[PDB]
């Protein structure tokens, strides 16, 4: 519970990153690519365009 740990928890539990992670993992467990490294790249590229 050092100020770093608390700061990390605040960032980890923030809205942006947590909803983005939830969305990405849901989509990834839908499509189920046998090479998630590249599918993540294309998915994030198309998301960033908006």
């Amino acid at each position: 519970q050092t100020p770093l740990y608390e700061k990390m928890r605040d960032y980890a539990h923030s809205n942006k990153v947590q909803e983005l992670l939830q969305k990405m993992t849901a989509d990834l467990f839908i499509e189920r690519p046998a090479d998630p490294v590249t599918w993540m790249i294309k998915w994030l590229s198309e998301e960033q365009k908006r």
């Binding site: 050092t2 100020p3 770093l4 740990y5 990390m8």
Partner: protein
């Protein structure tokens, strides 16, 4: 996992404070050396007297 690997904020600041203690010790040792030299000069003058 991230907290298992890495820091207690206290020891890191205490280690940062240590250089100052070392410098003060060096200064005190220099003072002692000066005192010893003064005593040697005093002994020489005592023999002359």
């Amino acid at each position: 996992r991230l907290v298992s690997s890495g820091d207690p904020v206290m020891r890191e600041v205490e280690t940062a404070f240590m250089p100052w203690l070392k410098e003060q010790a060096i200064g005190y040792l220099a003072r002692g050396v000066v005192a010893r030299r003064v005593v040697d000069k005093l002994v020489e003058d005592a023999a002359a007297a």
